[PDB]
Write a protein that binds this DNA or RNA. Structure first.
Lengths: 206, 224, 155
RNA sequence: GGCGUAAAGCGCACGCAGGCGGUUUGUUAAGUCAGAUGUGAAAUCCCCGGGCUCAACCUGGGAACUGCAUCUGAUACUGG
RNA sequence: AAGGCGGCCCCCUGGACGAAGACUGACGCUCAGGUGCGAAAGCGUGGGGAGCAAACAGGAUUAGAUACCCUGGUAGUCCACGCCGUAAACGAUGUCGACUUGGAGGUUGUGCCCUUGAGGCGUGGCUUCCGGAGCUAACGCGUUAAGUCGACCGCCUGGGGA
RNA sequence: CUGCAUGGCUGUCGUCAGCUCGUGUUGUGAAAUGUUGGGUUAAGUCCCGCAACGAGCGCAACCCUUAUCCUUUGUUGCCAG
């Protein structure tokens, strides 16, 4: 069977939204198309910087991007230098005057997006896929993830037929709404087409 | 520990002839009313042979485990293990207490959560069903693992009332290389048992006699 | 400390509604190069999981055997199921001249010099049973001195 | 090496040739065992040497030719 | 002995088993070739023929129904005397002998016991079901072995062809 | 062009009560046991048993809506006195 998206069923229960601005119907489609391009930019720039999550709010006129990332140093560059040359190409893309922030991520082993990006990276430099999965599971479980499954898919070690090996460890309860199930996803672009990588990460409940 | 005393209990009495193991042919006198009679000039050397080693185990601080999930012998074994401060089993022997210890020591760990977390943190977060759906788990764990809870590792000996009923226990002990002592009726098998002690195991004052002697010779070993 | 071969790895299978659940057996012997030998036989759904379950099952489950200068006492037979197995002590510098699964068992047992021969089946699992069956019933000159109550020039 | 189900127990009996034969003492010495002599061609094989620069190749001495016969003993087992 | 043997009565007759004693004194076991016995069907000569019933006939059923089902029905089934020599003729387990823990029964003898009860204590023979060690690929066999041995015989050596 | 090289997304058996693992144990082994049995439930739901002891994904609950009441708050909604 097909599963509901575990982020999406849990919005306004235990997960919060990422675009958190109000509009009326004139300017709604435009805000969406701005917020798309401000994310489609900041993903392409900060690929090395290890970015979990780009929140956007819109107070007043102005746009306010928070970034969450494993590596604050490489975004802030030196004296900002890089923060401040992000702002003035963001503030074109919005139209309004901008404001970038940063947060850490303390445990990059427990973010779904970063675990997936990680695994997806290793698969493009031709690492054996069972090692790449199984490192990632161990790493989360020694830093106290209550559980974690990962699930790669489709031409693994350059086979001619697609398969999906997956590998749980601990508890991962996806029909429990109360459960914080950090989830995310990534495509590895290899010489054998794409390989897709899901990652769930239970962290406990309420 | 006297042949006089043993005859007053009923240690000579067996099972009916029908139900014998022929491996117990050396430890038999003969039949009356079609019932086998245990030779007690075989018992008394073999009992005082065994209580030699129960003292010599208990001297060097080694843990005895009493076993008796006969309904006759159950309250005897509980009582007679708490006299010497050794460990016991009287509800169900669990398939793989000893061989699968590493797993069982979780449901010990669980019994030492639910006794403490209760009394002392007293829960008083409830729901009210979940107050007594822990009292129903703490009851059912106490029966099963109340005896062995403090043991902290494998025992250095077993003591087994009825070989034939508690055959799972004896069989487990001979994987691990633990010495086994057993009370062995005419109907029972001696083969796994290291020090066999032939005897009635059915009647209650028969059982109380043996545990009398073993209680005694553990405490004398413990005290030194 | 101790030496540890991998003999064989089957894939076995089990049918269900879905189709086939594949699974791997491995088969290992360990030994102290000096007259102790276990064998263990693991199963798991991955292959390195199974070798590991076998290496554990072999360490516990492991038996003594009195060799003589790195070869047998006397010419032994041995049998389990289809596999019959004859082994014969040899002069120094033969090497282990011996079959498939036999050859593993004898190397880590610390036999250096034998003439083996497997008749019958040569199913790896039943041959390492038959080989160990052989080696454990085989009996020293000091054991038979004791049996009969002697200690002669037969010693 | 097998023969209940994989190939394999005659449908069942009687029974001649054949094979096998309880226990004891004596005797015989056919089988059996031990010893001795005769023969078992030379080459070949195997061992220790020697000669071709080495090796193949050649060669000295031995062992072997598990056999057959005759003679003298042994007599537990088999046979008479 | 196997094939097999079933109302009651008579006549002729084979074997088995048990008890106590007497008698011969290894007279034994197995058996290629040989001789005998050998269900049912079938064949021969002559009787018999109720019921049943291959063939055959009609009726149904059915796409068809040369069948299953129905109504009939001939050989055959029965007796006598001959042949045929075969069967999943099977315990799918050659015969003879010895040894190796138990339990529950059945059948048929026999000896001791206030027979005091249709009973208590033993001792033979045949037989049914469980199951131990051991054996076996396993299923299972398991003192009536497929366990541990010995004697003689028969037979097997990929599937089809056959 | 190839869904018969792929990712992603979806239908389907089916909101059916199932599907598995670890450690132990039995078996030369594939495997088995657990997961079966006696009750019961919408439910491998729960209890009792039993060479099994435990764990996970599912079931259930945690979410939205509807069914009664209370508290607060009354315009653009309401009108008992």
């Amino acid at each position: 069977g097909q599963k509901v998206h575990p982020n999406g069923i849990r919005l306004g229960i235990v997960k919060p939204w990422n675009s958190t601005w109000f509009a009326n119907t004139k300017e709604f489609a435009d805000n969406l198309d701005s917020d798309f391009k401000v994310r489609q930019y900041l993903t392409k720039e900060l690929a090395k910087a290890s970015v979990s999550r780009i929140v956007i709010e819109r107070p007043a006129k102005s746009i306010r991007v928070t970034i969450h990332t494993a590596r604050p140093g490489i975004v802030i560059g030196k004296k900002g230098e890089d923060v401040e040359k992000l702002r003035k190409v963001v503030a074109d893309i919005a139209g309004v005057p901008a404001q970038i922030n940063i947060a850490e991520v303390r445990k990059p082993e427990l973010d779904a997006k970063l675990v997936a990006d990680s695994i997806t990276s290793q698969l493009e430099r031709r690492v054996m896929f069972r090692r790449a999965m199984k490192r990632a599971v161990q790493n989360a479980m020694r830093l106290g993830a209550k559980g974690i499954k990962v699930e790669v898919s489709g031409r693994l070690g350059g086979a001619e037929i697609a398969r999906t090996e997956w590998y749980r460890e601990g508890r991962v309860p996806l029909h429990t709404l109360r459960a914080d199930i950090d989830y995310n996803t990534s495509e590895a672009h290899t010489t054998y087409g794409v390989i897709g990588v899901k990652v769930w990460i239970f962290k406990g409940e309420i | 520990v006297s042949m006089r005393d043993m005859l007053k209990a009923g240690v000579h009495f067996g099972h009916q002839t029908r139900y014998w193991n022929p491996k117990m042919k050396p430890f038999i006198f003969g039949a009356r009313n079609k019932v086998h009679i245990i030779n007690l000039e075989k018992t008394v050397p073999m009992f005082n042979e065994a209580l030699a080693e129960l003292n010599k185990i208990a001297s060097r601080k080694g843990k005895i485990l009493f076993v008796g999930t006969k309904r006759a012998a159950s309250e005897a074994v509980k009582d007679a293990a708490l006299s010497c401060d050794q460990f016991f089993v009287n509800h169900r022997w669990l398939g793989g207490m000893l061989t699968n210890w590493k797993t069982v020591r979780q449901s010990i760990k669980r019994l030492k959560d639910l006794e403490t977390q209760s009394q002392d943190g007293t829960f008083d977060k409830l729901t009210k069903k979940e107050a007594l759906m822990r009292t129903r788990e703490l009851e059912k764990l106490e029966n099963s693992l109340g005896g062995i809870k403090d043991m902290g590792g494998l025992p250095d000996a077993l003591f087994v009332i009825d070989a034939d009923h508690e055959h799972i226990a004896i069989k487990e002990a001979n994987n691990l290389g633990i010495p086994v002592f057993a009370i062995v009726d005419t109907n029972s098998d001696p083969d796994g048992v290291d020090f066999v002690i032939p005897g009635n195991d059915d009647a209650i004052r028969a059982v109380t006699l043996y545990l009398g002697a073993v209680a005694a010779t553990v405490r004398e070993g413990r005290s030194q | 400390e101790l030496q540890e071969k991998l003999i064989a790895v089957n894939r076995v299978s089990k049918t269900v509604k879905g189709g086939r659940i594949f699974s791997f057996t491995a088969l290992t012997v360990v030994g102290d190069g000096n007259g102790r030998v276990g064998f263990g036989y693991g199963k798991a759904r991955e292959v390195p999981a199974a070798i590991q379950k076998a290496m554990e099952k072999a360490r516990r489950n492991m038996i003594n055997v009195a060799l003589n200068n790195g070869t047998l006492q006397h010419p032994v037979k041995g049998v389990h199921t289809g596999s019959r197995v004859f082994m014969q002590p040899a002069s120094e510098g033969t090497g282990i001249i011996a079959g498939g699964a036999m050859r593993a068992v004898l190397e880590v047992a610390g036999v250096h010099n034998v003439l083996a021969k497997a008749y019958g089946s040569t199913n790896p699992i039943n041959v390492v049973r038959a080989t160990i069956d052989g080696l454990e019933n085989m009996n020293s000159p000091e054991m038979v001195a004791a049996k009969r109550g002697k200690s002669v020039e037969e010693i």
